[PDB]
């Protein structure tokens, strides 16, 4: 449950960096007082990829 | 491409409901967003989707 | 409850597109289905959903 | 890929038994010439459960 909330934050942060919103990403980590490791993938990152999978499925119904 | 625009909205919603209102404002301005904005109740839809999705993916 | 009725339709579609046309007919008749029926291209929507879902669930 | 197709068939079969369509379930296994093991859960079975999860998500957008 908490592991989920922490992983959403991480992947939102990554998105903000790849979407060209770097200022926003930095302030986001300040506002949630993020004291944990940060491990980054390739653009457009995990959240875009999995969102688009579910979108393609949403638009087929 | 209309997928990317809905994700942006739901992320902006996430940021307000998680108490990252500053980032939220900065976000819209950095992507130069100009469309209309509507939201619902916290925690917001991105959180709702994530909970079932991440429970499916398990992992770390 | 309207969830259960869409699943039935998509299953009836699966059965026709997978070559289980006999089962398909028997199915409708056993649940006493009386609503209108529309389908699309094979393999059908239940297969489409399943492929992304089962790839998420992995398992066995 | 094939593992997926085989697991859909299995879980469709289970559904047909729990939904009160037992004749249909039997003929289904004939028509696909199913020569593999059959392992059954509790009603309403795996496919209903996971369908309803995605439905609840579909009806929240």
Numbering used by the authors:
A (entry chain B), D (entry chain B): 13 to 73
B (entry chain A), C (entry chain A): 14 to 73
Q: Which lines from the publication concern this structure?
A:
SSDP contains an N-terminal LisH domain known to form obligate dimers in other proteins, followed by a highly conserved extension and a long nonconserved C-terminal tail likely to be disordered. To determine the structure of SSDP-N, we optimized its boundaries and succeeded in obtaining crystals for SSDP1–86 that diffracted to 2.4 Å. As we were unable to use molecular replacement with the LisH domain as a search model, we generated 5 different selenomethionine (SeMet)-labeled mutants, 1 of which yielded diffracting crystals that enabled us to determine the structure of SSDP-N. The asymmetric crystallographic unit contains a classic LisH dimer-fold in which 2 α-helices (α1, α2) associate to form an antiparallel 4-helix bundle, the hydrophobic interface of which is strengthened by additional hydrogen bonds in its periphery. A third helix (α3) interacts with its counterpart (α3′) from the opposite dimer to form an X-shaped structure, tucked under the 4-helix bundle. As in other LisH dimers, the dimer interface is extensive (burying ∼2,500 Å2), which explains why SSDP forms obligate dimers, and why SSDP monomers are not detectable (see also below). Within the crystal lattice, symmetry-related dimers associate via 2 perpendicular pairs of antiparallel α3 helices. The resulting interlocked bundle of 4 α-helices bury ∼1,400 Å2, and is held together entirely via hydrophobic contacts, with valine 65 (V65) occupying a central position in the tetramer interface (“α3 interface,” below). Intriguingly, some of the hydrophobic residues in the loop between α2 and α3 also mediate association between symmetry-related dimers in the crystal, resulting in alternative tetramer configurations. We conclude that SSDP binds to Chip/LDB via its α3 surface.
